[PDB]
Amino acid sequence: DARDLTAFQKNILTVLGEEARYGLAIKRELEEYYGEEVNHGRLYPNLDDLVNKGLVEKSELDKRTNEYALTNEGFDAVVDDLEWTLSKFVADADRRERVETIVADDAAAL
């Protein structure tokens, strides 16, 4: 089950929900989120874990470079947690309008 993942592992999945990324690209995406450095020794063992759990697939481009992508299971985990989060956040009309605005503005910036 994916609901037991650590916050750091879920954030990797969130990053890859946007698009498949090289390991180094995931690291900088996480660093922009956390506002502090993400060590190589924290990211890559957790990438390994998610690959072994069946949530991420690894494509070997070169020695010292790989691309990571969500599996179907991984995407299901991302959508499952988003649904649960929204089921609790969308608690009244004001909350509905707030999310509608977030999504619309996110779309506009694409």
Torsion sign over Cα 23, 28, 31, 32: negative
Q: Is residue 19 a known part of a binding site?
A: no
Distance in Å, CB of 47 to its own copies, minimum:
17
37-57 CB burial, b ≥16 within 10 A, e <16: ebeeeebeebbeebbebebbb
List phi, psi (to 5°) of 27. Answer: -60, -45
What does 28 interact with, of its own copies, Cl ion, none (CB < 5 to 8 A by kind)?
none
Task: Tell which positions 37-96 bind its own copies, by CB under 8 A.
Answer: 78-79, 81-93, 96
Task: Tell which positions 3-32 bind its own copies, by CB under 8 A.
Answer: 3-7, 10, 14-15, 17-19
Rank residues 8 and 40 by Cβ distance to its own copies and give the closer one.
8
Q: Which residue from 85, 13, 103 is spatially nearest to 55, judged by alpha carbons? A: 13
Rank residues 60 and 93 by Cβ distance to its own copies and give the closer one.
93
CA angle 15, 18, 19 (to 5 degrees): 100
Q: Binding residues for its own copies, per CB under 8 A?
A: 1, 3-7, 10, 14-15, 17-19, 33-35, 78-79, 81-93, 96, 98-100, 102-104, 106-107, 110
